[PDB]
C-alpha cells in the first residue's frame, strides 16, 4: 500500500447531475424534443473532470 | 408553435339560424381540438373535446366535425346563450394556441342611427378641460364610422370611442364619442362637427354646433 499524488476528485463531492429525458411525443408520432438548460451552462475545465 | 386561425372572426346571424365555424391549422391536428364558449363577465365553458365528442352538460345543437388541418363547429339553432365568443385550441403541441374567436350579434332588434351633440358645461370650462360629446343611439349596424371635423379641418387621435353592450331590446349598441382640445386651440376653433358614416344610412349625417 503506497500514497500517490495525482489529479483526483475531493471526497464528499456531490458533483453536477445531468439526466437525459425522452422528447414530447404523441401515441405513435414523435413531437418536439424535451431537453434541459445544460447547453447554456458553462463550467471551467481547470484540470479535466471524472 | 402550431397556429390556429378561426375563419369567421365576426358574423351576423338571426335566432334559429344554422351557424358553421371553421378552424384552420398550418399542420395536421388529427383529432386534437377543444372548443370553448366565452360570455363576457364569466369564464369560458368547454363545448367539444377532440372536436369529435360533445362535452357533458352541453346542448346537442352544438356539434364537433372535421379532421386534421380543418375542423368545423355547427349549431343547428341559434339561441341567446349561443351568441358568445367561440375559441378553437390545438391540443397536439406542448403549448396550446387558441383560435382568433367568433362573435355573434342578435338581429332581432332593428334601429336607425340617432346623432346628438353636447357642448361642455361651465364647470368643464373653469376646470380648463373642454370635452364635446357626440352621442350615437339605437344604431342597427355593429360598427359605425365616426369622424370629427372642426373649422373644415379633420381631427385624429384627440377623440375616444366608448360603446355600451347590445341593448338586446333592439339588439343595438350605443356609442358616445368625446373630442378633447387644448384651451387655446378650442377657443380659436368655432364649429365642431361629428360626422358618422353608416352602410345602412343612405347619407353620412353631420351633427354640428358653433362654439358658444
How would you sum up this structure, described in words?
Chain A: Glycans are attached at residue 37. Chain A: Belongs to the betacoronaviruses spike protein family. Chain A: Spike protein S1: attaches the virion to the cell membrane by interacting with host receptor, initiating the infection. Spike protein S2': Acts as a viral fusion peptide which is unmasked following S2 cleavage occurring upon virus endocytosis. The structure is cut from a larger assembly and holds chains A (50 residues) and B (212 residues). Chain A has no helix or strand. With 50 residues, chain A is mostly loops. Chain B has a 4-stranded antiparallel beta sheet with strand order 1-3-8-7, with no helix packed on it. A 4-stranded antiparallel beta sheet of chain B has the order 6-5-4-9, with no helix packed on it. In chain B, β5 (45-49) and β6 (53-54) form a beta hairpin. Chain B is elongated and about 65 Å long. The N and C termini of chain B lie far apart (59 Å). The A-B interface holds A 24, 26, 31-32 and B 92-94.
Give a quick precis of the structure:
Chain A: Glycans are attached at residue 37. Chain A: Homotrimer; each monomer consists of a S1 and a S2 subunit. The resulting peplomers protrude from the virus surface as spikes. This is part of a larger assembly, with chains A (50 residues) and B (212 residues). By secondary structure, chain A is largely without helices or strands.
Amino acid at each position: 500500500t503506497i500514497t500517490y499524488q495525482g489529479l483526483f476528485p475531493y471526497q464528499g463531492d456531490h458533483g453536477d447531475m445531468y439526466v437525459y429525458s425522452a422528447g414530447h411525443a404523441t401515441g405513435t408520432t414523435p413531437q418536439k424534443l424535451f431537453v434541459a438548460n445544460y447547453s447554456q451552462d458553462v463550467k471551467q475545465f481547470a484540470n479535466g473532470f471524472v | 408553435d402550431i397556429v390556429m386561425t378561426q375563419t369567421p372572426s365576426s358574423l351576423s346571424a338571426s335566432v334559429g339560424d344554422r351557424v358553421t365555424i371553421t378552424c384552420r391549422a398550418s399542420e395536421d391536428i388529427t383529432s386534437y381540438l377543444n372548443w370553448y364558449q366565452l360570455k363576457p363577465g364569466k369564464a369560458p365553458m368547454f363545448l367539444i373535446y377532440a372536436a369529435s365528442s360533445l362535452q357533458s352538460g352541453v346542448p346537442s345543437r352544438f356539434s364537433g366535425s372535421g379532421s386534421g388541418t380543418d375542423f368545423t363547429l355547427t349549431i343547428s339553432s341559434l339561441q341567446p346563450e349561443d351568441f358568445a365568443t367561440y375559441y378553437c385550441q390545438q391540443s397536439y403541441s406542448t403549448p396550446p394556441t387558441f383560435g382568433g374567436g367568433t362573435k355573434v350579434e342578435i338581429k332581432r332588434t332593428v334601429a336607425a342611427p340617432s346623432v346628438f351633440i353636447f357642448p361642455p358645461s361651465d364647470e368643464q370650462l373653469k376646470s380648463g378641460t373642454a370635452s364635446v360629446v357626440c352621442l350615437l343611439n339605437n344604431f342597427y349596424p355593429r360598427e359605425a364610422k365616426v369622424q370629427w371635423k372642426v373649422d373644415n379641418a379633420l381631427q385624429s387621435g384627440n377623440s375616444q370611442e366608448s360603446v355600451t353592450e347590445q341593448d338586446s331590446k333592439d339588439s343595438t349598441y350605443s356609442l358616445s364619442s368625446t373630442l378633447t382640445l387644448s384651451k387655446a386651440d378650442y377657443e380659436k376653433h368655432k364649429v365642431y362637427a361629428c360626422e358618422v358614416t353608416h352602410q345602412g344610412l343612405s347619407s353620412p349625417v353631420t351633427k354640428s354646433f358653433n362654439r358658444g
